[PDB]
């Protein structure tokens, strides 16, 4: 309900941002939007906080473990013949994963396929469709999340919404 885990680690950097490593638990004191919340740190510190990255502190169903125990292990790369470090002549920088990214956002899937969980991790969607990427690591190969069904994809193919 109020107070959430961070069990997504976050590690931000700044005065609008919470960053958290390790369940840490962070009470909610204003949430003027949904996607992110304003949290406070367990010593009295007060910054922004992605959604996503926490549970919401609610039991119900069995098997808490949303995924402990993964594949953080990024997938390999499909296409052979390195088509191009970057998106086709884009005069903006809608390039991969420029960094942290805006989003946990909401961003319109306009090329995918149909993957399973299971095959690299990577979510089902469709274009025209839109994903809400939270996962975050390196600035290429990252993960993110649409109805749950996380898993990776490089963003040379979606359109970020105006949030």
Known sequence: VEYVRALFDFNGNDDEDLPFKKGDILKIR????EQWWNAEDMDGKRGMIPVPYVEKCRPSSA???????????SSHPQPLGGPEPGPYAQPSINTPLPNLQNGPFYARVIQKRVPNAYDKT???????????????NMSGQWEGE?????????????RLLDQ
């Open 30 to 33: 204003d949430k003027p939007e």
């Open 63 to 73: 098997s808490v473990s949303t995924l402990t125990g993964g594949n953080q292990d």
């Open 122 to 136: 990577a979510l089902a969607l469709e274009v025209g469709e839109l994903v809400k990427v939270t996962k975050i």
């Open 146 to 158: 649409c109805n749950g069904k996380r898993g990776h994809f490089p963003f040379t193919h979606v």
